[PDB]
Amino acid sequence: GFGCNGPWDEDDMQCHNHCKSIKGYKGGYCAKGGFVCKCY
Secondary structure, three states, X not given: OOOEOOOOOEOHHXXXXXXXXXXXXXXXXXXXXXXXXXXX
């Protein structure tokens, strides 16, 4: 979700911006074959 819609629809920036809006996270990217927005 959050832009991570598989290896043909992998919007890392959308995920990153989603993750950065959550207190305590620095960023994010698509993981698990493009299907998971992973925040860090």
